Structure 1
Amino acid sequence: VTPPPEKFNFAEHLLQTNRVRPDKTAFVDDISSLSFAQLEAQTRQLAAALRAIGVKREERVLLLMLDGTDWPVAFLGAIYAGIVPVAVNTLLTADDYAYMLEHSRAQAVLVSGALHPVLKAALTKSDHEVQRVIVSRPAAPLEPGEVDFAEFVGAHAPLEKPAATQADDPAFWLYSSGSTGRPKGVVHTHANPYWTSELYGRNTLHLREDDVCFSAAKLFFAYGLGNALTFPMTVGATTLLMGERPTPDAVFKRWLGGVGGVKPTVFYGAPTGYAGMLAAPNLPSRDQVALRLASSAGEALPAEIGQRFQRHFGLDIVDGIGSTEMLHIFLSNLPDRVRYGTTGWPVPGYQIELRGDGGGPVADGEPGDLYIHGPSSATMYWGNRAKSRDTFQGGWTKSGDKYVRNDDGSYTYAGRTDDMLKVSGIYVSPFEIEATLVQHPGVLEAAVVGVADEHGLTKPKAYVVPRPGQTLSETELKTFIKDRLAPYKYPRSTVFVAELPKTATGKIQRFKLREG
């Protein structure tokens, strides 16, 4: 793979690539579609629009949008202007967004109408610097000074040239959280999505022009940003986007060609989703679908799920691991070489190391902490030098995962070095869930651990000491957690216990709860 030139704008790169196919569909959703040409036009008008409201080069904008055709216009339009979009999870709280606004010093917000209520709450509460709110598909009347996305784009002539950025200039941010503390602003360069799209999208998956890509993983996820934007645009594939929550039925509807008169050839999702599909009574048969490739990430794929999908479809699931910090997958199975119970082999272009207690290599068959050296690594966490030091060092990125290398050179997942649970593509902090539970007046103490369910998929499990003198039923606690947490954080079950095991410091011995 040839390195990008030092003068490089990733958006211009993707536009240029597709000038050969102006009339092919680039993106399609339930209500709209853009050809590559229409996408280019709208991308450049949005870039002009942002500039005309005074957003400058290197300044951030918040991109808080459901998957839809306006998403890649917002993302690429900012990048084409040399403005840095901060692409965020659409399921967070107003407080989360308030923090992001302050931390990013976002100068404008591009927001889906459905998300305007949360965003409004975030604006009201924070010391932000937002100059304009641009609403895609408004769902309530616009407030004074807000503008409709279609009008904002339609009101401005296309910018004539992209910003003259360098390959190693910041291009976009994603946010990633740890087990405590605020989300960290992961800063990616213009070169980074070129490398992931070439080393993984093209050279590993062998995506091609005639493909139709459909990712259950949304565009704000690093995994989904590659799957359903950078990868397909790099090869001229057509991409299907879906605003709604993925469920088996919504996925199957699309697999069967229920939207945009296209049937996906490449599907991407989490092991949890693949399990949920395989359990669905109306799972389609292989003759009804056009799938040629099925990708998975977001948690380790249990072997039985891959094996059952292959028995039903005659297609393997291709499991690989990436991270927000590395932008996309660096260790993967291949479309023609799958070893279930493993995450496969290093992706060419990326170097992997497993390190023991002192930094040194570990013998084969033994677990070590996983570190990655590749050209798509983020540069830093913005404004957090201490965490940057811990994660990015001398070209190596520390993943927080442990792995074992097998005799055939494959890698098998061995757990985490920090307590986070990966529940279907979203990291969930047990400590968050614990701090929520103890705010119920009937709960004295709470400990949350991950437990593998009947399909081998990790879900949170809560152990709760109730407060003597109150009543607290499992149902009231369910109602309370329904009211306080996103469903992606719910414990799969809660057990009431009389006490928890602790050190004399009062540290809860969570390892004993993963035992019995």
Structure 2
Amino acid sequence: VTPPPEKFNFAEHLLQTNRVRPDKTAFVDDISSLSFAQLEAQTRQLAAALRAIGVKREERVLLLMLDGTDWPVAFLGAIYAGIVPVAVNTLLTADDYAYMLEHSRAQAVLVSGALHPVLKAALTKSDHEVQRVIVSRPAAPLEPGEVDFAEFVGAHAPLEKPAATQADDPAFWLYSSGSTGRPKGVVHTHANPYWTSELYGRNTLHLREDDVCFSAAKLFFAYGLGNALTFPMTVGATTLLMGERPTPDAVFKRWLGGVGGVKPTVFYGAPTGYAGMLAAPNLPSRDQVALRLASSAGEALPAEIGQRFQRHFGLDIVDGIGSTEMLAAFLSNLPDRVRYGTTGWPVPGYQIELRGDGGGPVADGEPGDLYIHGPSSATMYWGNRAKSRDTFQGGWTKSGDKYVRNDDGSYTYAGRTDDMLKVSGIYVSPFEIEATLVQHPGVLEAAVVGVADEHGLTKPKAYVVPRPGQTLSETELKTFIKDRLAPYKYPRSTVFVAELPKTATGKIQRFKLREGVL
């Protein structure tokens, strides 16, 4: 793979690549579609619109939008103008967005109408620098100053040339959370999604022009950003986007060609999603779908889920591990080489290290801390030098995982080194859940650990000490957590206990809870 030139604008690169297929569908969702030509026009018109309102090169804008054909226009349009889009989760609270607006110093916000209310709350309570709010598909009247995304794009002539960016300049940000502290702004360069899209999308998955890509993982996830934007645009594939929550019925409807007259040939999701679909009553048969490749990421794929998917569809699930910091997978099974119970082999282009307790090599079969050296690594966490020093160490990126290398060169996941839990393939901090539970007036203490469910998938499990003298029923506690935590963070069960095992210094002995002692 030939490195990108030093003068390089990722958005312009993706546009140029597809000037050979102007009338092929680039993106299609429930209500709209965009050829590569139409996408290029609207991308460059949005870039001009953003510059016209005074957003200058290297400044950030907040991109808070459901998956839809407007999403890649917003993302590539900012990048084409040398403006840095900060692409964020659509299921967060006003407080979360308030912090992101201040931390990013976003100068404009591109928001889906359905998300305007939470953004309104975030703008009102924050010390933001937002100059303009641009609402894609408004769901309510427009407040003074705000503009409709389609009118905004339609009102400016396409920018004549891209910003003269370098390949190592920041191009976009994603946020990722550790076990405590604020979400971390992961800064990715113009080069990084070129490397992931060439090394993984093209050379590992073998995506191609006649593919139709469909990702249960949303575009604001690093995984989804590759699956359904950078990978397909790199090979000219057509991408199906879906705004709504990715339930089995929603997914099946798309698999069967219920949207845009296209049937997906490549599907991406988390193992939890695959388990959910395999259990659905209306699982399609192979003759009904056009899938040729099924990708999985976010959490380890239990062998039995892959085996059941293979037995039903005649297709393996290809399990790879990536991270927000590395942007896409660096360890992966191959489409024609799958070993269930492992994450496969290093992606060519990435060097992998397992380090022991002195930082040195570990022997095959023993766990070590995983570190990755690859050309797609994020450069830093914006504004957090301490965590950046901890993570990005002179060419090597600490993943937070432990892995075991097998005799055939494959790698088996062996857990985290930080307490973080991956539930439905999404980061969850047990300390957040604990902190939420102890604000219930009936809870004295709480400890949360991860437990494998019947399918081998990790879920939170809560141990709660009731506050003496307070009626506390499981049902009232479930309702308490319903409106305070996103559903994927719900504890699978809650065990009420009279005490928690504690050292003798006030620390909960969480491993005894993992061990089943209570």
What's the TM-score bracket when you normalise by the shorter of the two chains? over 0.9
Distance (Å, rounded) in 1 between the aligned partners of 2:294 and 2:396: 30
Q: RMSD of aligned C-alpha atoms?
A: 0.4
Distance (Å, rounded) in 2 between the aligned partners of 1:299 and 1:20: 38
CA deviation after TM superposition for structure 1 residue 503, in Å: 1.1
Q: Give the equivalent residue in structure 2 for 1:145.
A: 145
Distance (Å, rounded) in 2 between the aligned partners of 1:58 and 1:394: 25
In the TM superposition, what whole-angstrom CA distance separates every residue of 1:243-299 from its partner, at most 9, and x where no partner exists? 000000000000000000000000000000000000011100000000000000010
Distance (Å, rounded) in 2 between the aligned partners of 1:263 and 1:465: 51
1:102 and 2:124 correspond: no
CA deviation after TM superposition for structure 1 residue 51, in Å: 0.2
In the TM superposition, what whole-angstrom CA distance separates every residue of 1:116-174 from its partner, at most 9, and x where no partner exists? 01101100000000000000001011111000000000000000000000000000000
For structure 1, list consecutive stretches of 5 or more residues without a partner in the other structure.
none
Distance (Å, rounded) in 2 between the aligned partners of 1:483 and 1:82: 39
Secondary structure of the 2:68 match is coil
In the TM superposition, what whole-angstrom CA distance separates every residue of 1:298-350 from its partner, at most 9, and x where no partner exists? 10000000000000000000000000000000000000000000000000000
Secondary structure of the 2:63 match is strand
For structure 2, list consecutive stretches of 5 or more residues without a partner in the other structure.
none
CA deviation after TM superposition for structure 1 residue 424, in Å: 1.4
Distance (Å, rounded) in 1 between the aligned partners of 2:114 and 2:488: 19
Distance (Å, rounded) in 2 between the aligned partners of 1:180 and 1:384: 13
CA deviation after TM superposition for structure 1 residue 213, in Å: 0.1
In the TM superposition, what whole-angstrom CA distance separates every residue of 1:29-79 from its partner, at most 9, and x where no partner exists? 000000000000000000000000000000000000000000000000000
Distance (Å, rounded) in 2 between the aligned partners of 1:372 and 1:101: 31
Distance (Å, rounded) in 2 between the aligned partners of 1:79 and 1:489: 33
Secondary structure of the 2:324 match is coil
Distance (Å, rounded) in 1 between the aligned partners of 2:140 and 2:511: 49
Secondary structure of the 1:85 match is strand
In the TM superposition, what whole-angstrom CA distance separates every residue of 1:6-39 from its partner, at most 9, and x where no partner exists? 0000000000000000000000000000000000
Q: Give the equivalent residue in structure 1 for 2:360.
A: 360
Identity %: 100
Secondary structure of the 2:483 match is helix
Q: Give the equivalent residue in structure 2 for 1:406.
A: 406
Q: Give the equivalent residue in structure 1 for 2:303.
A: 303
Q: Give the equivalent residue in structure 2 for 1:19.
A: 19
Runs of 4+ in 1 over 3 A off after TM superposition: none
In the TM superposition, what whole-angstrom CA distance separates every residue of 1:432-486 from its partner, at most 9, and x where no partner exists? 0000000000000000000000000000000000001010000000000002111
CA deviation after TM superposition for structure 1 residue 426, in Å: 1.2
CA deviation after TM superposition for structure 1 residue 373, in Å: 0.1
Distance (Å, rounded) in 2 between the aligned partners of 1:384 and 1:461: 31
TM-score, normalisation: structure 1: 1.00
In the TM superposition, what whole-angstrom CA distance separates every residue of 1:356-381 from its partner, at most 9, and x where no partner exists? 11111111000000000000000000
Distance (Å, rounded) in 1 between the aligned partners of 2:262 and 2:127: 45
Q: Give the equivalent residue in structure 2 for 1:500.
A: 500
Distance (Å, rounded) in 2 between the aligned partners of 1:151 and 1:490: 41
1:166 and 2:166 correspond: yes
Distance (Å, rounded) in 2 between the aligned partners of 1:359 and 1:384: 24
Secondary structure of the 1:484 match is coil
Distance (Å, rounded) in 1 between the aligned partners of 2:247 and 2:37: 32
Distance (Å, rounded) in 2 between the aligned partners of 1:494 and 1:292: 41
In the TM superposition, what whole-angstrom CA distance separates every residue of 1:379-411 from its partner, at most 9, and x where no partner exists? 000011111000001100000000000000000
Secondary structure of the 1:268 match is strand
Distance (Å, rounded) in 2 between the aligned partners of 1:306 and 1:425: 15
Distance (Å, rounded) in 2 between the aligned partners of 1:397 and 1:418: 15
Distance (Å, rounded) in 2 between the aligned partners of 1:87 and 1:160: 25
Secondary structure of the 2:182 match is coil
Secondary structure of the 1:115 match is helix
CA deviation after TM superposition for structure 1 residue 505, in Å: 1.2
Secondary structure of the 1:196 match is helix
In the TM superposition, what whole-angstrom CA distance separates every residue of 1:161-203 from its partner, at most 9, and x where no partner exists? 0000000000000000000000000000000000000000000
Secondary structure of the 1:479 match is helix
TM-score, normalisation: structure 2: 0.99
CA deviation after TM superposition for structure 1 residue 489, in Å: 1.1
Distance (Å, rounded) in 2 between the aligned partners of 1:182 and 1:248: 33
Distance (Å, rounded) in 2 between the aligned partners of 1:155 and 1:446: 55
Indicate the larger mover: 249-258 or 486-495.
Answer: 486-495
CA deviation after TM superposition for structure 1 residue 504, in Å: 1.2
CA deviation after TM superposition for structure 1 residue 488, in Å: 1.6
In the TM superposition, what whole-angstrom CA distance separates every residue of 1:84-121 from its partner, at most 9, and x where no partner exists? 00000001111010000000000000000011011011
CA deviation after TM superposition for structure 1 residue 425, in Å: 2.2
Secondary structure of the 2:412 match is strand
Distance (Å, rounded) in 1 between the aligned partners of 2:8 and 2:19: 17
